[PDB]
Amino acid sequence: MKELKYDVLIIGGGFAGSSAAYQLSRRGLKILLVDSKPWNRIGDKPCGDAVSKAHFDKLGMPYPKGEELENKINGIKLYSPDMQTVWTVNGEGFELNAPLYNQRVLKEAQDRGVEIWDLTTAMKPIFEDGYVKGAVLFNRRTNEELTVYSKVVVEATGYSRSFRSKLPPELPITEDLDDKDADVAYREVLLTKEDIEDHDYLRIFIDQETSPGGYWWYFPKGKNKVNVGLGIQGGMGYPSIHEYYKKYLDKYAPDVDKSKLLVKGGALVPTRRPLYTMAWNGIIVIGDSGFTVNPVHGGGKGSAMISGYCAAKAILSAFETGDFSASGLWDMNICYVNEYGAKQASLDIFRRFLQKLSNDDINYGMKKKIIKEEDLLEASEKGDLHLSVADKAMRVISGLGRPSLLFKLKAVAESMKKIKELYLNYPRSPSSLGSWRREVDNVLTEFNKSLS
Ligand SMILES: Cc1cc2c(cc1C)N(C[C@H](O)[C@H](O)[C@H](O)COP(=O)(O)OP(=O)(O)OC[C@H]1O[C@@H](n3cnc4c(N)ncnc43)[C@H](O)[C@@H]1O)c1[nH]c(=O)[nH]c(=O)c1N2
Ligand SMILES: CC(C)=CCC/C(C)=C/CC/C(C)=C/CC/C(C)=C/COP(=O)(O)OP(=O)(O)O
Structure with a gap:
């Protein structure tokens, strides 16, 4: 089989993969991005197509223009x-016109040095001595099976998780979701x-x-x-x-x-907290594949771009040190938890609460102004449910004369507090991942039972 040598292989060219490609470009690296879709369909996964402007402003991603x-x-x-x-x-x-914007990001990355193969599927990992070392690809434009070696694979395959799911199941990077x-x-x-x-x-x-x-x-x-x-x-x-x-x-x-x-x-x-680690030996996972979506409002195009930004950062650092181990790529986790992941974890708790409320609960809470519409915005900022907000909410519903899960809001805030603290103390190295993960799982398990 034909064998090629690249610095980075990006699998998937949606908002996550294309952001990573764009953020890594003009740097002198040899980068290949592949997508199973033909060029003019890349980016066309069903979506509401809504993205906050703040994400473009903080990441230095191109504004959408014209038909975009x-x-x-x-x-x-x-x-x-x-x-x-x-x-x-x-x-x-x-x-947005998601495909049109997405394709423009890719074409600019391409103009800036990134190689792109459409109609090309990463069929299986190259995995040896505990490292991801590339992928076997099938290019349906050329009808060729190709072996591509890379120092780092960026797994951006969306919900399909079609590459990392083929790695040995004992690895943290293969984590599934409920x-x-x-x-x-x-x-x-x-x-x-x-x-x-x-x-x-x-x-x-x-x-x-x-x-x-x-x-x-x-x-x-x-x-x-x-x-x-x-x-x-x-x-x-x-x-x-x-x-x-x-x-x-x-x-x-x-x-x-x-x-x-x-x-x-x-x-x-x-609709959950991200992958407990988004980094392992020779690989980083981003976007829906790494569970980057906001658990409460379901928005993931913005966070996908954030995950591509963090990936590019960690990868550039890894080329400085020569260390492509989990430890060498660990800044992926540190960056992503800081920028959005900790917020997600808090909202993972809050989501579970919301999904158990009745229509009568939600009608009553909204009508009685259980929170200000402005507090909604403040809370959405970092996913925090502050004391004064929770206390006021409890006083507001204090006249309700039926059983309701609304009265558990104080305990919801407490659990959100617990999980936020854990994510503020994200493991500084892979060797602490396991005990930290069990702490987070325990918080979730205890919270689940509280709502049951
Ligand atoms: C109906 C609906 C509505 C919304 C949303 C989702 C859904 C389903 N979301 C979420 C948002 O759309 C989603 O989080 C992101 O588009 C995820 O982008 P990714 O790049 O991670 O995955 P995405 O799935 O977009 O891209 C993955 C790419 O990988 C490719 N691929 C997969 N496996 C491969 C392989 N083995 N080899 C090669 N290529 C491979 C695929 O072809 C695809 O192009 C959303 N978000 C938001 O912010 N605003 C909103 O309005 C909404 N609304
Ligand atoms: C439909 C699904 C599955 C997900 C949708 C995801 C959502 C709700 C996306 C909304 C993104 C969007 C257009 C946000 C703009 C509206 C808004 C309230 C933005 C708030 O961002 P800030 O910039 O922090 O607000 P300020 O400008 O007031 O500071």
């Missing part, structure tokens, strides 16, 4: 199940018959009956075009999401023209 930016976003309207209470959170963001720690989500993009009211605002609709464990959404892509969809929690035995969509679409999108559909599709999305 479908609609400027100025905030989000959050709807109670009975739709009688709406909370507004203001903030700048973009409704079925209940992901959503299935489905969306369509449609034209609308009436102008879209406040089209610069996303709409998110909480409802445990029409989207159990997730939510419905209505994300305008223009004055007369909307991305509408829902996500529901996995591992709960729920019926087909396509059947939820058909049944309740009219509730959330009565204005759409069902004859003018531009795109439709679904996929899985992780």
Whole structure:
């Protein structure tokens, strides 16, 4: 078989892989990125396509321009199940043409020295002496099977986790996730018959009956075009999401023209803390493959880009030291936990609480102003549930005259506090990973039982 030598092999060219490629470019490294999809389809996984502007501003990723930016976003309207209470959170963001932006990032990375092979699948790892050392690839453009050696593989295969899942199962980098720690989500993009009211605002609709464990959404892509969809929690035995969509679409999108559909599709999305380690010998995992998605609102394009930024940093450091061991690449973990992972862990707890609340609970809490709509924004910043907020919330619901899980909010805050402390003390080396992990698992196990 043909054998090639690269510094870095990036597997997957979505927001995660393309960010890593972009952030590693113009540095004199020999980099190959591969994706199973043809070029003009790269980036087209079903998504609501909404990304906060802050992520581009902090990472130095290109702003979306032209046909890439479908609609400027100025905030989000959050709807109670009975739709009688709406909370507004203001903030700048973009409704993207995801494939068009994604492909432009890749083409610029390519112009900046990164080699790209589309229609190419990494079929199996090269693994020897405890190290990932590359991949066997099948290039369906050339109908060639190729062996590529790399100092580091960047695993950016999305939810498929189609490379790291083929590594020896004893390795931390092969960590799987519980079925209940992901959503299935489905969306369509449609034209609308009436102008879209406040089209610069996303709409998110909480409802445990029409989207159990997730939510419905209505994300305008223009004055007369909307991305509408829902996500529901996995591992709960729920019926087909396509059947939820058909049944309740009219509730959330009565204005759409069902004859003018531009795109439709679904996929899985992780909703948990990240991989306990995103680094091992000769490999870093990023994006959905590394469980980088915000457990509460399900947004992962922004955090995918953050994970690509951290990966590039750790890899550049590893080429300085010559150390591509787990230890040599460990800054991946330190960087990612700092930038988003600790926040995710806190929100992993909070998610579990939200998914157990009833519609009556959520209607009541929102109507009684259990929190300010402004406290929502502060909490979303680092995923913190502060004392004064929790205490006030408890006083607000103190008149409620039925059993409710809302009264567990104080204990939720306590568990969030516990897990945040653990992530603030992320293991400085691989040799501490195991005992730290068991501490985190114990916090989660104790929390689960508290809600049962
Ligand atoms: C319906 C729906 C809606 C939303 C969202 C998800 C879903 C399903 N999310 C989440 C967000 O879309 C998601 O977190 C990111 O797109 C993940 O990007 P990645 O690059 O990690 O994976 P992604 O799956 O995008 O890319 C993985 C790539 O790897 C390739 N690949 C896989 N295995 C391979 C192999 N062995 N060899 C070669 N290539 C391989 C695939 O071809 C693919 O291009 C979201 N996020 C957000 O911020 N805003 C939102 O609006 C939403 N809404
Ligand atoms: C549909 C699924 C599965 C996920 C969606 C993921 C989401 C909700 C993405 C929204 C991203 C977006 C457009 C955010 C902009 C709106 C907003 C409130 C941004 C807040 O960011 P900040 O910059 O911190 O706010 P400020 O500008 O007020 O400081």
